[PDB]
Amino acid sequence: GSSGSSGYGSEKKGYLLKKSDGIRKVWQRRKCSVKNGILTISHATSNRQPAKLNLLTCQVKPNAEDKKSFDLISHNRTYHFQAEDEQDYVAWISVLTNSKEEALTMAFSGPSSG
Protein backbone atom coordinates (compact mmCIF):
# COMPACT_ATOMS: atom_id res chain seq x y z
CA GLY A 1 0.00 0.00 0.00
CA SER A 2 1.00 3.61 0.60
CA SER A 3 4.07 3.69 2.84
CA GLY A 4 5.15 6.63 4.98
CA SER A 5 2.70 9.19 6.36
CA SER A 6 -0.59 8.98 4.47
CA GLY A 7 -2.95 11.65 5.77
CA TYR A 8 -5.12 12.50 2.78
CA GLY A 9 -8.56 12.35 4.37
CA SER A 10 -11.84 10.45 4.21
CA GLU A 11 -13.38 13.11 1.97
CA LYS A 12 -12.92 14.00 -1.70
CA LYS A 13 -15.06 15.53 -4.45
CA GLY A 14 -14.22 15.49 -8.14
CA TYR A 15 -14.71 13.48 -11.32
CA LEU A 16 -13.86 9.92 -12.38
CA LEU A 17 -14.36 7.46 -15.24
CA LYS A 18 -16.57 4.37 -15.24
CA LYS A 19 -16.97 1.60 -17.82
CA SER A 20 -20.26 1.83 -19.72
CA ASP A 21 -23.21 -0.26 -18.53
CA GLY A 22 -21.70 -3.34 -20.14
CA ILE A 23 -22.44 -3.67 -23.84
CA ARG A 24 -19.46 -1.39 -24.43
CA LYS A 25 -16.14 -1.02 -22.60
CA VAL A 26 -15.79 2.73 -23.15
CA TRP A 27 -14.69 5.03 -20.33
CA GLN A 28 -17.09 7.90 -19.64
CA ARG A 29 -16.45 10.86 -17.34
CA ARG A 30 -18.85 11.23 -14.41
CA LYS A 31 -19.02 13.44 -11.32
CA CYS A 32 -17.99 11.35 -8.30
CA SER A 33 -18.23 12.12 -4.59
CA VAL A 34 -17.02 10.48 -1.37
CA LYS A 35 -18.30 11.37 2.10
CA ASN A 36 -19.09 9.48 5.30
CA GLY A 37 -17.56 6.41 3.68
CA ILE A 38 -20.04 6.51 0.81
CA LEU A 39 -19.46 6.92 -2.93
CA THR A 40 -22.20 8.59 -4.98
CA ILE A 41 -22.41 8.53 -8.77
CA SER A 42 -24.48 11.10 -10.68
CA HIS A 43 -26.38 10.09 -13.81
CA ALA A 44 -25.96 11.51 -17.31
CA THR A 45 -28.51 9.64 -19.42
CA SER A 46 -31.32 10.02 -16.89
CA ASN A 47 -31.44 12.91 -14.42
CA ARG A 48 -33.55 11.07 -11.85
CA GLN A 49 -31.36 9.97 -8.94
CA PRO A 50 -27.65 9.28 -8.25
CA ALA A 51 -26.12 5.97 -7.17
CA LYS A 52 -24.56 5.57 -3.72
CA LEU A 53 -22.05 2.81 -2.98
CA ASN A 54 -21.15 1.79 0.57
CA LEU A 55 -17.36 1.56 0.82
CA LEU A 56 -17.70 -0.38 4.08
CA THR A 57 -19.04 -3.37 2.14
CA CYS A 58 -17.32 -2.61 -1.17
CA GLN A 59 -13.72 -3.63 -1.88
CA VAL A 60 -11.30 -1.20 -3.53
CA LYS A 61 -8.90 -3.18 -5.72
CA PRO A 62 -6.22 -0.73 -6.92
CA ASN A 63 -4.38 -1.84 -10.06
CA ALA A 64 -1.05 -3.59 -9.53
CA GLU A 65 0.94 -2.09 -12.40
CA ASP A 66 -1.38 -0.17 -14.72
CA LYS A 67 -1.29 3.04 -12.69
CA LYS A 68 -4.40 5.23 -12.65
CA SER A 69 -6.80 2.29 -12.32
CA PHE A 70 -8.97 0.75 -9.60
CA ASP A 71 -11.85 -1.72 -9.42
CA LEU A 72 -14.75 -1.33 -6.98
CA ILE A 73 -16.18 -4.68 -5.86
CA SER A 74 -19.75 -4.35 -4.61
CA HIS A 75 -22.15 -6.85 -3.02
CA ASN A 76 -22.22 -9.63 -5.62
CA ARG A 77 -21.21 -7.01 -8.19
CA THR A 78 -18.09 -5.62 -9.85
CA TYR A 79 -17.52 -2.07 -11.10
CA HIS A 80 -14.82 -0.48 -13.25
CA PHE A 81 -13.32 2.93 -12.47
CA GLN A 82 -10.39 4.92 -13.87
CA ALA A 83 -8.65 8.11 -12.76
CA GLU A 84 -7.82 11.05 -15.03
CA ASP A 85 -4.26 11.69 -13.86
CA GLU A 86 -1.56 10.10 -11.70
CA GLN A 87 -2.07 12.63 -8.91
CA ASP A 88 -5.84 12.16 -8.97
CA TYR A 89 -5.53 8.38 -8.72
CA VAL A 90 -2.97 8.22 -5.91
CA ALA A 91 -5.30 10.37 -3.81
CA TRP A 92 -8.56 8.67 -4.80
CA ILE A 93 -7.20 5.28 -3.73
CA SER A 94 -5.90 6.80 -0.49
CA VAL A 95 -9.35 8.24 0.21
CA LEU A 96 -11.70 5.45 -0.85
CA THR A 97 -9.65 3.06 1.29
CA ASN A 98 -9.21 5.54 4.14
CA SER A 99 -12.87 6.56 4.38
CA LYS A 100 -13.65 2.84 4.56
CA GLU A 101 -11.25 2.05 7.41
CA GLU A 102 -11.64 5.35 9.26
CA ALA A 103 -15.30 4.31 9.33
CA LEU A 104 -14.72 0.68 10.30
CA THR A 105 -12.26 1.42 13.10
CA MET A 106 -14.97 3.55 14.70
CA ALA A 107 -17.58 0.88 13.95
CA PHE A 108 -18.44 -2.32 15.82
CA SER A 109 -16.43 -5.43 14.96
CA GLY A 110 -18.75 -8.11 16.31
CA PRO A 111 -22.21 -8.28 17.91
CA SER A 112 -22.51 -9.04 21.62
CA SER A 113 -25.82 -9.48 23.46
CA GLY A 114 -25.90 -6.57 25.90
Comparing C-alpha atoms, which of 91, 49, 46 is closest to residue 70?
91
Closest CA to 91 of 19, 29, 34: 34
Phi, psi dihedral angles at 94 (to 5 degrees) = -60, -40
Return the H-helix or E-strand segment holding 10: none
**In the chain, what is the greatest distance between 2 CA atoms, to the nearest angstrom?**
51
Neighbours of 30 (CB within 10 A): 16
| Gap between the Cα atoms of 71 and 62, Å rounded | 6
Angle at 45 between CA 94 and CA 33, to 5 degrees: 20
Does residue 70 contact residue 60 with C-beta atoms inside 8 Å?
Answer: yes
* CATH numbers and ranges of domains, the chain: 1-114 (2.30.29.30)
Beta-bridged to residue 80, according to DSSP, are 71
